[PDB]
Amino acid sequence: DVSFRLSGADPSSYGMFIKDLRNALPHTEKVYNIPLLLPSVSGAGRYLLMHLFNYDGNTITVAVDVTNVYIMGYLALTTSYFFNEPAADLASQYVFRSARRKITLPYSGNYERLQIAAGKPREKIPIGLPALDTAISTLLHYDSTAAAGALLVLIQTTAEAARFKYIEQQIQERAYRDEVPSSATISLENSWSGLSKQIQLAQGNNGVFRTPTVLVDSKGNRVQITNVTSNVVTSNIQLLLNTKNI
């Protein structure tokens, strides 16, 4: 299990937390020096528990699927909460068994459904470490509309940061002041699966992508990614979704 304390947090300690989160995910191989997440893990080993603590020291524990870095659910005091989706339902067989009750949220965990439930897209929800403190505080007492927005923050500050160094750095820039995500950040979040697939396919195509991935860059410009020499592959992406799940 991995942990993070907002009390005393700084860019360096968040950086270390994201490094621990990445190093908690198992892999048997690397593809262009990037950890390749496992196609499958059976039973309880499929789930990592992230313990998050707000400024005041209250905690939630988040269950994360180690094969895709998807948040399945979380535990706040004695109540467990899971997305309304089969994967999460399964995960509820293995984690937080001791919760006094289990609530299924009224939405699945994908960004489209969360944005609907929250009533606004990601583009307009500020993220950062203070947003993450708020999110943990929100998740402590059930409120489904507010939780949707908290979950969008949680996702992007934990899973998306683990996936991409550029997003980790965005959050480090927002250690003491929230700000809406950059376009580039949204683009990468949306392209993870596609990037992962093409990087895997490039191994057998001399590092060349079968189909190029279009992204938005640091500057706000459309850019086309065609091979593993791109900075997105050499520097940015940190974990690959196994094509066995694409």
Q: Is 47 annotated as a binding residue?
A: no
Helix (H/G/I), strand (E/B), else coil: 55: coil
* The only residue of 7, 78, 110, 144 in contact with ligand OCCN(CCO)CCO, by rule CB under 6 A: 110
Q: How far is the CB of 162 from ligand NAG (least distance, A)?
A: 24
Query: Is 198 a binder of ligand NAG (CB under 6 A)?
Result: no
Would you say 200 and 241 are in contact if contact means Cβ atoms under 8 Å apart? Answer: no
Contact of 71 with 89, CB cutoff 8 Å: no
Residue placing its CB nearer to ligand NAG in the complex, 110 or 235: 235
Distance CA 93, CA 219 (A): 45
Task: Check binding of 229 to ligand NAG (CB under 6 A).
Answer: yes
Given the rule CB under 6 A, which of 27-35, 83-91, 199-207, 211-219 is the region that contacts ligand OCCN(CCO)CCO?
83-91
Q: How far is the C-alpha of 184 from the C-alpha of 191, rounded, in Å?
A: 10
Q: Which residues pair with 79 in a beta bridge?
A: 76, 101
C-beta of residue 65 within 8 angstroms of C-beta of residue 46: yes
Residues tagged active-site: 160
| Residue partners of 246: CB distance under 8 A and separation at least 6 | 193, 196, 197
Q: Min. distance of Cβ 229 from ligand NAG in angstroms? A: 5
Looking at 16-24, 67-75, 225-233, 238-246, which segment touches ligand NAG (CB under 6 A)?
225-233
Q: What is the dihedral of CA 73, 78, 79, 82, to 10 degrees?
A: 20
Is 74 marked as binding a ligand?
no
Gap between the Cα atoms of 58 and 76, Å rounded: 9
Question: Which of 126/207 has CB closer to ligand NAG?
Answer: 207
The three-class DSSP label of residue 242 is coil
The verdict on whether residue 31 carries a ligand-binding annotation is: no
Identity of the residue, 78 or 235, whose beta carbon is nearer to ligand NAG in the bound complex? 235
Instruction: Say whether residue 81 binds ligand OCCN(CCO)CCO (CB under 6 A).
Output: no
Asked if 194 is part of the footprint of ligand OCCN(CCO)CCO (rule: CB under 6 A), the reply reads no
The contact set with ligand NAG (CB under 6 A) reads 226-227, 229-230
